Design an enzyme around this catalytic site. Structure first.
Site, mmCIF file in Angstrom:
data_model
loop_
_atom_site.group_PDB
_atom_site.id
_atom_site.type_symbol
_atom_site.label_atom_id
_atom_site.label_comp_id
_atom_site.label_asym_id
_atom_site.label_seq_id
_atom_site.Cartn_x
_atom_site.Cartn_y
_atom_site.Cartn_z
ATOM 1 N N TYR A 42 -8.201 -10.250 -1.390
ATOM 2 C CA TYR A 42 -8.482 -8.858 -1.616
ATOM 3 C C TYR A 42 -8.463 -8.540 -3.101
ATOM 4 O O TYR A 42 -7.844 -9.248 -3.901
ATOM 5 C CB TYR A 42 -7.461 -7.998 -0.895
ATOM 6 C CG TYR A 42 -6.111 -8.017 -1.553
ATOM 7 C CD1 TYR A 42 -5.760 -7.031 -2.467
ATOM 8 C CD2 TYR A 42 -5.194 -9.034 -1.287
ATOM 9 C CE1 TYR A 42 -4.543 -7.045 -3.091
ATOM 10 C CE2 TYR A 42 -3.950 -9.058 -1.916
ATOM 11 C CZ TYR A 42 -3.640 -8.055 -2.815
ATOM 12 O OH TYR A 42 -2.422 -8.045 -3.444
ATOM 13 N N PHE A 52 -5.743 -2.669 -9.786
ATOM 14 C CA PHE A 52 -4.288 -2.607 -9.693
ATOM 15 C C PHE A 52 -3.685 -3.875 -9.086
ATOM 16 O O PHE A 52 -2.502 -4.145 -9.284
ATOM 17 C CB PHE A 52 -3.809 -1.355 -8.970
ATOM 18 C CG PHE A 52 -4.230 -1.268 -7.536
ATOM 19 C CD1 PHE A 52 -3.535 -1.951 -6.541
ATOM 20 C CD2 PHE A 52 -5.334 -0.507 -7.172
ATOM 21 C CE1 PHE A 52 -3.931 -1.852 -5.196
ATOM 22 C CE2 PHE A 52 -5.734 -0.419 -5.831
ATOM 23 C CZ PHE A 52 -5.032 -1.108 -4.851
ATOM 24 N N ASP A 53 -4.494 -4.660 -8.365
ATOM 25 C CA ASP A 53 -3.980 -5.864 -7.720
ATOM 26 C C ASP A 53 -5.115 -6.710 -7.181
ATOM 27 O O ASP A 53 -6.180 -6.195 -6.928
ATOM 28 C CB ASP A 53 -3.056 -5.459 -6.571
ATOM 29 C CG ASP A 53 -2.171 -6.596 -6.086
ATOM 30 O OD1 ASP A 53 -2.025 -7.630 -6.794
ATOM 31 O OD2 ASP A 53 -1.632 -6.442 -4.963
ATOM 32 N N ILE A 72 0.579 -1.728 3.615
ATOM 33 C CA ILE A 72 0.197 -0.312 3.768
ATOM 34 C C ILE A 72 -0.566 -0.048 5.063
ATOM 35 O O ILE A 72 -1.200 -0.929 5.650
ATOM 36 C CB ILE A 72 -0.587 0.236 2.535
ATOM 37 C CG1 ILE A 72 -1.923 -0.463 2.322
ATOM 38 C CG2 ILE A 72 0.299 0.216 1.291
ATOM 39 C CD1 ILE A 72 -2.861 0.309 1.396
ATOM 40 N N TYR A 98 0.286 4.411 -0.634
ATOM 41 C CA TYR A 98 1.635 4.571 -1.221
ATOM 42 C C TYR A 98 2.115 6.001 -1.372
ATOM 43 O O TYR A 98 3.223 6.245 -1.901
ATOM 44 C CB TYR A 98 1.745 3.831 -2.554
ATOM 45 C CG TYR A 98 1.562 2.352 -2.380
ATOM 46 C CD1 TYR A 98 2.626 1.535 -2.017
ATOM 47 C CD2 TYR A 98 0.316 1.773 -2.557
ATOM 48 C CE1 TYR A 98 2.448 0.172 -1.847
ATOM 49 C CE2 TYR A 98 0.128 0.422 -2.382
ATOM 50 C CZ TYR A 98 1.196 -0.362 -2.027
ATOM 51 O OH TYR A 98 0.960 -1.703 -1.863
ATOM 52 N N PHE A 115 -10.118 -0.985 -1.638
ATOM 53 C CA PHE A 115 -9.896 -2.413 -1.465
ATOM 54 C C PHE A 115 -11.174 -3.093 -1.046
ATOM 55 O O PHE A 115 -11.893 -2.591 -0.190
ATOM 56 C CB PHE A 115 -8.887 -2.688 -0.367
ATOM 57 C CG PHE A 115 -7.479 -2.357 -0.758
ATOM 58 C CD1 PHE A 115 -6.723 -3.261 -1.488
ATOM 59 C CD2 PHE A 115 -6.932 -1.146 -0.367
ATOM 60 C CE1 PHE A 115 -5.388 -2.931 -1.838
ATOM 61 C CE2 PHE A 115 -5.629 -0.808 -0.698
ATOM 62 C CZ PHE A 115 -4.870 -1.687 -1.432
#
Length: 124
Positions: A42, A52-53, A72, A98, A115
């Site tokens: 992902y 962010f990731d 999540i 979040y 995502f």
């Protein structure tokens, strides 16, 4: 903007909390059941388009048990809709991510998350 305008609302409440667009069709007709081990790659972006990731920085699949709240809410909901090998885009309201707490500093309070998720495999 594409997912926001054309994405399928895959939440039960229909509150547009998780919107989905399939980008690459998967191979099975099968989707993971709750409790299945799921293996994903992902990439996540905020609304300014900033990363962010990503699982790709380590190049190691992210692994979790579906529908156990190990991730999540948008993922427990979205990944359940995916077929093996599928890649989809998920636009995720903070209520399904979040929330007001965020995940600071990477993820601000009340952030809507985007995502790109590939379902690599899953096993019951």
């Amino acid at each position: 903007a594409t997912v926001a305008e054309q994405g399928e609302d895959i939440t039960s409440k229909k509150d547009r909390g998780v919107l989905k667009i399939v980008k690459r069709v998967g191979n099975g007709e099968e989707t993971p059941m709750i409790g299945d081990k799921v293996y994903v790659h992902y990439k996540g972006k905020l609304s300014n388009g900033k990363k962010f990731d990503s699982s790709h920085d380590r190049n190691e699949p992210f692994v979790f048990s579906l529908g156990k709240g190990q991730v999540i809410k948008a993922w427990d909901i979205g990944v359940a809709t995916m077929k093996k090998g599928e890649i989809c885009h998920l636009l995720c309201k903070p209520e399904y991510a979040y929330g007001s707490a965020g995940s600071l500093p990477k993820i601000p309070s009340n952030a809507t998350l985007f995502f790109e998720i590939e379902l690599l495999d899953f096993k019951g």
